[PDB]
């Protein structure tokens, strides 16, 4: 048998090594469902697992939707694209709904510490943002807002409890700025957030230790890359 | 050339 | 319908959704019509990628499992068994497709060799994980397919044929890895390469490219196996 | 010496 918590975490680590992220997410969902708090290491296993799962689905959906755009333009040729893009969409939506379900049923705890609350709320914003990437209906407004709320709630915590060099704070601001640019269609808000975030973390880089510096400068480079792309430096 | 987000 | 399944398999390929692609190709095969050379490759690519990932994962887990003593619990064995069962199920599906629809009395030697190579290949995948007494029969089921394909390729095809070349490459891999006959493996790879080399002069731009590709895989294997 | 080709 061996579907006790420790064994589920062991199997999620093993699934990661084997690049079986569908399986890893399943083990992590089962581990979450045991009701114990996730350690920082455990949190990352859950995040990595689902990030990879949705990652592949989103990637596929983008491929199909671009093809569909070509198919429906003025003066092109003569349903499979739409049908199959809908299959992938439904599948992707199901995964987000699963992650969001876990976050609201077990992971988001008023009781949790600042770094973990931020982690999960950033996660809630990411997965709603993923739903908003494919949302076309009247639901788009509700979804967009559900992501805004989660990121903003996470922002508020990160800005009080964390230093501007915190990789979790940095990561959140990066994603929230991507949300503004892509989803909310607020490039001005996005550029500013990314600029401020980077500039504030830069002003504190001197204090950081060997390990801290590596994780922080990683995200800062992602912010800088985005800023270069968005502004045209 | 694609925007960066979560690692 | 069939058209739509092939269309969707091509779309799944573009979206790198090989699990879906294999499903569509299985459904297209099940329509009963002959797959076109293009359509065969779609089926092969789809399943090759699916099993490819499973085998890769199984090798990772089995290595972790064998490097016992540096820890190993029931999760390594249990999870390696999960992946194994899953992988075995895919092979069983492909082989089912092959016996039920693809391997037919007489077609063109190219399609004929392709599907028997395929049969050998998927039995070899099963052999890769096989541990019991079944190992013997699975190994034999692969030997038979590869040999039946060999017989066709050696009669109907020139030694430069990429399908003939590819088959010989995989059968030599079978002789080395699976059958544990390195002598037989080295010889097959040597003969195959040497015979295709003796006919390279005849080939056109398109032909040459495909043939020399496999010839390099044969040469790389020979270098690895002989230690030169 | 790396993995055999197939």
From Swiss-Prot, chain A:
Q: Primary place of residence?
A: cytoplasm
Q: Which residues carry this modification: Phosphoserine?
A: 7, 76
Which cysteines in this chain are paired by disulphide bridges? none
Give the GO biological process terms.
cAMP/PKA signal transduction; establishment of skin barrier; intrinsic apoptotic signaling pathway in response to DNA damage; keratinization; keratinocyte development; keratinocyte proliferation; negative regulation of innate immune response; negative regulation of keratinocyte proliferation
Q: Where in the cell is it found?
A: Cytoplasm; Nucleus; Secreted
Task: Provide a Gene Ontology MF annotation, just one.
Answer: identical protein binding
Q: Where is this site: Interaction with phosphoserine on interacting protein?
A: 58, 129
Q: In which tissues is it expressed?
A: Present mainly in tissues enriched in stratified squamous keratinizing epithelium.
InterPro entries reported for this sequence? 14-3-3, 14-3-3_CS, 14-3-3_dom_sf, 14-3-3_domain, 14-3-3_sigma
Q: Which CDD domains match?
A: 14-3-3_sigma (cd10019)
Q: Specify the superkingdom.
A: Eukaryota
Regarding how it is modified after translation, the entry says:
Ubiquitinated. Ubiquitination by RFFL induces proteasomal degradation and indirectly regulates p53/TP53 activation.
Cellular component GO terms, alphabetical: cytoplasm; cytosol; extracellular exosome; extracellular space; nucleus
Keyword set, alphabetical order: Cytoplasm, Nucleus, Phosphoprotein, Secreted, Ubl conjugation
Output the SUPFAM superfamilies linked to this UniProt entry: 14-3-3 protein
Q: What does this protein do?
A: Adapter protein implicated in the regulation of a large spectrum of both general and specialized signaling pathways. Binds to a large number of partners, usually by recognition of a phosphoserine or phosphothreonine motif. Binding generally results in the modulation of the activity of the binding partner. Promotes cytosolic retention of GBP1 GTPase by binding to phosphorylated GBP1, thereby inhibiting the innate immune response. Also acts as a TP53/p53-regulated inhibitor of G2/M progression.
Outline the subunit composition.
Answer: Homodimer. Interacts with KRT17 and SAMSN1. Found in a complex with XPO7, EIF4A1, ARHGAP1, VPS26A, VPS29 and VPS35. Interacts with GAB2. Interacts with SRPK2. Interacts with COPS6. Interacts with COP1; this interaction leads to proteasomal degradation. Interacts with the 'Thr-369' phosphorylated form of DAPK2. Interacts with PI4KB. Interacts with SLITRK1. Interacts with LRRK2; this interaction is dependent on LRRK2 phosphorylation.
Q: Name the PANTHER family for this protein.
A: 14-3-3 PROTEIN
**Entry similarity comment:** Belongs to the 14-3-3 family.
Q: What is this protein called?
A: 14-3-3 protein sigma
Q: Which organism is it from?
A: Homo sapiens
């Amino acid at each position: 048998p061996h579907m006790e918590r420790a064994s589920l975490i062991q199997k999620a680590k093993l699934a990661e090594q084997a690049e079986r992220y569908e399986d890893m997410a399943a083990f992590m969902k089962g581990a979450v469902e045991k009701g114990e708090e996730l350690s920082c290491e455990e949190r990352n296993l859950l995040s990595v697992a689902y990030k990879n799962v949705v990652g592949g689905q989103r990637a596929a959906w983008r491929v199909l939707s671009s093809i569909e755009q070509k198919s429906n333009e003025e003066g092109s040729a003569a349903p499979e694209v739409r049908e199959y893009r809908e299959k992938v969409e439904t599948e992707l939506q199901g995964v987000c709904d699963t992650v969001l379900g876990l976050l609201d049923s077990h992971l988001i705890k008023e009781a949790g510490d600042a770094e973990s609350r931020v982690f999960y709320l950033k996660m809630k914003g990411d997965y709603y943002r993923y739903l908003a990437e494919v949302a076309t209906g009247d639901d788009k407004k509700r979804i967009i807002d559900s992501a805004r709320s989660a990121y903003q709630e996470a922002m508020d915590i990160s800005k009080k409890e964390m230093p501007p060099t915190n990789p979790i704070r940095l990561g959140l601001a990066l994603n929230f700025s991507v949300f503004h640019y892509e989803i909310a269609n607020s490039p001005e808000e996005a550029i500013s957030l990314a600029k401020t975030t980077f500039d504030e973390a830069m002003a504190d880089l001197h204090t950081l230790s060997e390990d801290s510096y590596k994780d922080s400068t990683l995200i800062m480079q992602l912010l800088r890359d985005n800023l270069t792309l968005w502004t045209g430096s | 050339l694609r925007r960066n987000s979560g690692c």
